[PDB]
Design a protein around this ligand. Sequence first.
Ligand code: HEM
Ligand SMILES: CCSc1ccc(C(=O)O)cc1
Ligand SMILES: [Cl-]
Ligand SMILES: [Mg+2]
Length: 393
Amino acid sequence: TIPHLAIDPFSLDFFDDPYPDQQTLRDAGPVVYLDKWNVYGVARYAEVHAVLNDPTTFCSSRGVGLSDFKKEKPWRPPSLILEADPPAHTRPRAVLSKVLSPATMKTIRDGFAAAADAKVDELLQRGCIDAIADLAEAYPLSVFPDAMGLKQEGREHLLPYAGLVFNAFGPPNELRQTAIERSAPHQAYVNEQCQRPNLAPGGFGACIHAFTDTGEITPDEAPLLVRSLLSAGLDETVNGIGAAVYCLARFPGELQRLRSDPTLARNAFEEAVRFESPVQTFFRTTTREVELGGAVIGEGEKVLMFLGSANRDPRRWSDPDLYDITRKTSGHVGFGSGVHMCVGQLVARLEGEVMLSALARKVAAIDIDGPVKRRFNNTLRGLESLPVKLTPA
Ligand code: HEM
Ligand SMILES: CCSc1ccc(C(=O)O)cc1
Ligand SMILES: [Cl-]
Ligand SMILES: [Mg+2]
């Protein structure tokens, strides 16, 4: 009753161009079985949204990667928030929700916006740049570690650790195993910076520790929660900003609309998150035998969700493959949906918005002028290099 497919969603062939295969996964049925990895898969918007919003049936405490924590040991201690279900998930979630709250965004917006303006003016003096290394990567690295309260020493481990985290969600292919095997130096750096004395007072990490006073988390829980913000938020935001620049170069009419109304910057970034879906895939594990679509999934089975596919499903989106900066983007699952929906979404949107605002006000054209290279990762989509020429407005 359930179609079996041999598509490998963790192959380089898939990463290079997943969209034809995503249609095949969508059109094969509401639920598919991926024989290559012995997991179920859902690729349409309806089922992805349904799974995300049914946490008691499709749980996260057995891991949101391929590996099942009931069967295998986690490569690192499980995340206190991402790999927890209610009620264990709730109070750590509340802490990060307050640390990364709307109120918090007021304290960082001016600095984040000023840095984005300055970065774009710096790049305009160069003309031709790499929009990944010199922009999409450079800008978040220039604001987020400082906002986190990290010391200067050791920040060279941040990008390697982020890449490792998202590769480890995947199957035990080469990308995953090569990342985990010699990852101890990255883990030692991260674990050290999660300790209270190493975090600048007033930053995100120190604020997490400050919540131990309230009874929401214990002191021994706090380092693990800080770790979440050195795991998530970097590569996804980098990839999202890079995709936004790519779309503004490939859809030049949309850059001209953004220039004419820079207040579209926030939605222009949201549309890029839907278009790119920097977090392409992750898993749930069934706690019960379940009827999804017309399929009966057994208990203890891994269920792979295709967020990028859900955000390009023509059953839900008009012209899903077009980048449209005035599209009504509410309802996309690029940030997830339900109880786990990205707790850092306000930080990501802030970085994306102010960068696209700086582009909107300062740049007249963005032209690709060199070979474009893709960045390969088991669960992230994004570019490795994006040579562009920036024309000043
Ligand atoms: C464009 C940027 C981003 C994208 C596409 C993204 C994507 C996601 C997604 C899809 C989830 C849901 C995971 C699940 O349901 O299992 C999630 C959760 C999460 N995100 Fe993000 N994220 C982004 C930025 C950030 C930032 C900037 C931070 C931190 C500053 C962050 C921290 C987290 C954390 C801690 C969770 C776990 C939340 C929970 O389980 O309750 N993310 N993110
Ligand atoms: C799968 C969504 S991206 C993400 C990665 C790691 C964490 C964490 O370490 O808590 C949270 C979210
Ligand atoms: Cl670690
Ligand atoms: Mg300033």
